[PDB]
Symmetry: C4
Subunit: 374 residues, 4 copies
């Protein structure tokens, strides 16, 4: 993942949420270096293990209690256990990916520094820092308000329907796991959006340099080809770093969307208190936004990477210089055999098409379920 000064605070968040057991330090001549932090690695492992144990322990006491409010019937038990276990699995996979991703992180950061060295005019450090910090703050604030509203509505329903603080305490670890999941989403989205921005800047450089002395252009094209290859390598590195984590995040999004939609439709049919309906609608919106935060950056990066070949062809059709058109032909040959789609550890390609697939499931699972009640 990306560790840059412009979004250094992001890294700190990832370090505080048991997802970045690393330490970043400038050396003498610039050059931030990322090394393993044994203290923070131990802290992250212990925190993840303790929190998973705590949430499962709370679930087990809720099931083995003389008055349950969320376990209750067998189907409710199964749904709640599946949801909690899916979140737990996503959290554990993210912590594991951050645990053994030191070498990939250093390689990606070195490649990103090398790439950003060339694209000096298009840096926009202030704008990128502002956007990244705004995204992180917005996501954290939204998840905080949503967790507060959920706990408030749950305590309200348990109070109207008397020994509820114990259940709330048992269920707090689930909410902290949701916080960690939000942090994981923030980290992955930041890295993928950085890759997409660098691809867009490369395309803009290629467009400006030729649509709007020959040796400067020759090594410019050479550096552009090198940067495109390095960006492809960075995409592959991010895939290796976060593939299984993103796969389990997508599984979590699908499961939560289906379960929340089914519960919302059932509650609307039963015509119960509207506050739970608003809470469920907010949860649906949050899950859809999570799915978008995962899918959109990968699709944007893949689309921006594939456009470079058209600009290269247009450049080729507007060159009367032989060594530089030879370099352009080499660039076109390199781009023809190239991929930049983020792969969830090979199981699927992460782009907007995933959304369609999810719909094709979310509808089907609903059609079997929604009308089975009646």
């Amino acid at each position: 993942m990306e560790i840059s000064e412009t979004n250094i605070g992001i890294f700190y968040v990832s370090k505080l949420l048991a997802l970045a057991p690393y330490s970043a330090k400038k050396n003498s001549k610039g050059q931030l270096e990322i090394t393993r932090s044994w203290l923070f690695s131990i802290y992250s492992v212990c925190l993840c293990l303790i929190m998973v144990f705590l949430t499962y322990r709370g679930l087990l006491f809720d099931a083995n209690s003389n008055i349950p409010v969320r376990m209750k019937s067998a189907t409710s038990k199964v749904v709640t256990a599946s949801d909690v276990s899916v979140v737990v699995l996503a959290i554990v996979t993210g912590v594991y990916c951050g645990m053994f991703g030191l070498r990939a992180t250093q390689e990606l950061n070195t490649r990103l520094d090398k790439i950003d060295s060339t694209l000096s005019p298009y840096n926009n450090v202030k704008k990128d820092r502002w956007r990244a910090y705004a995204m992180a703050t917005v996501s954290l604030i939204v998840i905080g308000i949503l967790l507060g509203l959920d706990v408030g509505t749950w305590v309200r329903m348990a109070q109207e329907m008397e020994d509820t603080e114990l259940n709330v305490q048992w269920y707090i670890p689930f909410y902290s796991l949701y916080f960690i999941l939000t942090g994981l989403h923030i980290n992955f989205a930041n890295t993928a959006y950085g890759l997409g921005r660098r691809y867009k800047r490369l395309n803009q450089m290629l467009r400006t340099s030729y649509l709007s002395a020959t040796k400067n252009k020759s090594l410019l094209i050479r550096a552009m080809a090198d940067n495109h290859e390095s960006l492809g390598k960075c995409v592959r590195l991010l895939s290796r770093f976060y593939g299984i984590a993103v796969l389990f995040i997508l599984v979590s999004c699908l499961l939560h969307l289906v379960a929340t939609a089914y519960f919302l439709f059932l509650e609307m049919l039963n015509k119960r208190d509207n506050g739970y309906v608003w809470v469920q609608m907010l949860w649906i919106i949050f899950h859809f936004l999570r799915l978008l935060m995962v899918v959109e950056p990968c699709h944007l990066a893949a689309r921006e990477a594939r456009k470079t070949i058209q600009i290269v062809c247009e450049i080729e059709r507007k060159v009367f210089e032989p060594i530089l058109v030879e370099e352009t032909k080499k660039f076109w040959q390199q781009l023809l055999v190239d991929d930049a789609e983020f792969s969830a550890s090979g199981l699927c390609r992460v782009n907007r098409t995933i959304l369609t697939s999810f719909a094709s499931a979310i509808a089907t699972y609903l059609v079997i379920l929604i009308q089975f009640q009646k």
Copy 2:
């Protein structure tokens, strides 16, 4: 979208249906220009908002009425609300796409003028105008008769089963929204069919120029390559202009097809009045024709664009001139890395394959639903 004299009347229809908030005016030396029309933009926004509010208000009064004829039971309420809301969503998305699509429209029209300047022998202005006007008139006439028949059968059923004009008045806005949807279909089909026709004309020029003095052919091949690239850019521009609108139109087609088929099968099982059966069959035919009007032009354009590479290869195998065969090799290289499939904002590729997918859903959703009644 396309704004040309040959189908200028089409644009007027799109302007009258709150879908084209633009003004087209010739300047001095030919050259139609498209500019933003503030009056018509405000009119379109106000009309869309007022009509959506009116149809939802009619639905809400129908639900909160002492005698409902379309809301009634909970499942009927859900089906009717989903259908109306889907049409509303498609209408709103189309109006939004036309609202903020000024720059794309001007770019597409300038590119189309540049392309059509080269293909002077193959213009067929009278034929294209006749076909476009016939398509628009046929679609409007069909939707008018269908809406009249639907309102007639609904008023007949409500009269035989007494205070019905109020419900008809409440439901008129739904029919006007259907009119706007038909206009949106007409506009998109016109643009996509124009792109397909231009691709076919380019292919015919390439076939005729070589299957049936060398510098004329050299710049002819250069202009053909430029026109093919510009047509690809126009396809991408149309995708950017109408992607989300086409996606929601496809969702509308699928939902309406499934709902109408289910209702028709249920009515046939109940063996009720046959007039409603004929009305439902007409609605099914109309929805299928809408789906075809969306899918067929995109598939035709994609197929016609992909054929150019075969003609280019055949030309390459029949050339003994070195600079022009070099140009032909450049054309082949450009065509090899090229796409022209219309994408519904990246979620799916719009071609005839979509039909198959729809069947794979329409059957499944029916199998779960049709036999669940018995």
Copy 3:
């Protein structure tokens, strides 16, 4: 479709089954020519219309009879009507494709003659004639015995459970339509297998000419490239000729497989007479064999066409002659941008993958249906 002497009898069968309204006649200097036969065209149209009317009339009298044996309950009526109508639709589509496919047939036959002129050593006229006639005879014999067994078991069940010859007479037209469908399958399989055989012969020529004086090889490679392009054009011509017919044939295969499997499982659960079980098993085998007869030739042709590029690359790596390696490079360039997959009028690609898709449906439709009985 293919009209050659080696399988001329096949054409006669297609002429007798209202599928080939053409007349083939040698001219003076060899050169069979295919022309429109007005008498046979009128005969085919009248026979198809009369037979469709007869089968639907028999179905309608069976439904409106005081004792039905196949209509009976509403679900049985729906299943029988859907099956009969699907067969009718496939028959009508095949007759329509043969009705307006004169120009495609002549073009395909001329291209096939031109191709076969080059591949003189690999002709095997006796072997191809024997195989084609054996396939046609086997298919006709199998369908005859299956229809006889089905009518025998139906008359036996109606006799044990008395005025049955009337129902048998009403249902005979369905069996004649099955005969026409078998003829359509034979025709399509013959054409596709001929295309695949020609592709294989081209590949064998390419392998033998180089793995086992230079101008002979140069024009040999030129003729091989021309023949490959012509074979691709022939595949596209067959697609244009039989796309919608093959699509409806595949729909028929899927529907019949699902319905027969469901009926067989229901009968086995009810533990009724075993003779109907054997008849249903034979029908399942026949439907699977029909699906294979449609899918396998297209997949074989597509696989054999795609292999040529590997042989061309191997030839390129073993050539020290400059004009002929230039020709080989042109051949490789032509093969790189090329497709030969049979497309069912653009809706789907016909290959073995279709089988998988069918399973993914046949299982699902069964899971919803088989366990719904219990």
Copy 4:
């Protein structure tokens, strides 16, 4: 399949499990040769036929017994018969593939020897032998303990719920068929992993030779291209050898996963003895491990084969030698048109994506089934 000294013992296992009716013998000057073993071929055919007959006979006596413990109800009969028949089908297909795969085996082994002759520095004979023998021993030990545990829990349940040794004897042949299936998995995994290892070694050679006198490098690149083509041919040979067997193995994995998950959920709902729950969980883990053992090697080989083009491009961008860059261009041209994905006899491509598809089924089949109980 692969017959090498490093894993010669593996072959012996495949010979003892009626899957490798061959005999491997060194000739005078090295060069192991594989010939048909008539004695072992007859033994394999007889053993497979006798074992299939024995397991079906045991099933039939269990069904026609005055006290059944696994047939019982109709749905239990159907599930057990389908599972046993699926295992039988996989076993028969594997034995048939090994029966008529002599020529493919010799061709693959000769090609593998030719390839391994070039990659002399990267041999790791001890490591490969250790890994292969460890994999075989681990798989056999796991299946042995699982079969023992299953028979123990079945005899325990039948004893607590008395004439059980007869049923255990009737069901032993099913367990021996499971042993044969495990052997088939071991053989296929060994061959595919060998292909993947050779691809990885080729990539490592290409990386080392250039990232870290010119004629040596020229014939080195030539030999690398030859080895890559031969590895592709070996992948195609393995596909031809084991396609239908792998397809039926995948069908077996899907069916067993779905059935075991459904039975486990039903048992957990019924809250019966936990020992059967642990046994079912172990069976689920084993089926998932089988599916991984089939899918992972093919995906790894396909991924390692596709990476060579990037290394070739990087080499091309770092060469100032004209004949060798010409050879590199030829290598790039060969790699551009090339595939190495294992195909299950054309029906599907075997990679990690299959897993996703399986989930998309396993969920759906469960959603229809799991909640239908309640």
